[PDB]
Amino acid sequence: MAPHFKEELRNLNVRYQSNATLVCKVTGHPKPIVKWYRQGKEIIADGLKYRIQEFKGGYHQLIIASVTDDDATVYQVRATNQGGSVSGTASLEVEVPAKIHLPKTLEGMGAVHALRGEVVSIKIPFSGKPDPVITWQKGQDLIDNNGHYQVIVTRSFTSLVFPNGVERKDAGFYVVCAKNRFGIDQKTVELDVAD
Ligand SMILES: [Cl-]
Ligand SMILES: [Cl-]
Numbered sequence: 690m691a692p693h694f695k696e697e698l699r700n701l702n703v704r705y706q707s708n709a710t711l712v713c714k715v716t717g718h719p720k721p722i723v724k725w726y727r728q729g730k731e732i733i734a735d736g737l738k739y740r741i742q743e744f745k746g747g748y749h750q751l752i753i754a755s756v757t758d759d760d761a762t763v764y765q766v767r768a769t770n771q772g773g774s775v776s777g778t779a780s781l782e783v784e785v786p787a788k789i790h791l792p793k794t795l796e797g798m799g800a801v802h803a804l805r806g807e808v809v810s811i812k813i814p815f816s817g818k819p820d821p822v823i824t825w826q827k828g829q830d831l832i833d834n835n836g837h838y839q840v841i842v843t844r845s846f847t848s849l850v851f852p853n854g855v856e857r858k859d860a861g862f863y864v865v866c867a868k869n870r871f872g873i874d875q876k877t878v879e880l881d882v883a884d
Contacts, residue, residue: 691773787817799878
């Protein structure tokens with residue numbers, strides 16, 4: 690009997706830093722040998738990031754520890770005997786709730802100290818999967834790109850920039866917010882401007 694997946698690999702949605710477990714059940718005679726792959730590159734069990742467990746009745750399990758977005762990909766499992774070889778595939782998607790990560794806080798909030806005319810960037814790392822929506826406000830007036838401010842949003846941070854150089858009036862309290870479907874998080878940064 691050529692190998693068969695009696696129970697196929699399942700797609701997984703797993704929360705960041707948890708362990709992800711991929712399981713399948715394999716039939717075949719002679720008993721198939723199972724290899725595991727991350728996007729087409731063989732995974733070698735090392736006992737730490739990757740562990741393999743096999744049980745009676747043809748069950749085969751891979752445990753991927755402490756899952757990062759790096760682990761969020763397509764996985765293959767292959768079963769092979771002298772009668773044939775077949776693979777199954779599943780995806781792992783890693784849910785990270787939206788979150789703002791202030792490098793430095795003073796008295797509760799972020800703080801940026803600037804001199805007049807300095808081209809300031811308020812740079813704010815964040816997390817979230819799905820990628821979150823980002824907004825900035827000053828107190829409570831939304832900011833988009835106009836003639837005064839520029840917003841940068843990349844995969845991992847957002848920056849509020851004062852491309853024309855800060856003016857004394859730029860002093861105040863800026864609120865940055867990251868939102869996805871696993872949640873919302875906001876933080877405030879105080880800017881002060883020195884002359
Ligand atoms: Cl990036
Ligand atoms: Cl000014």
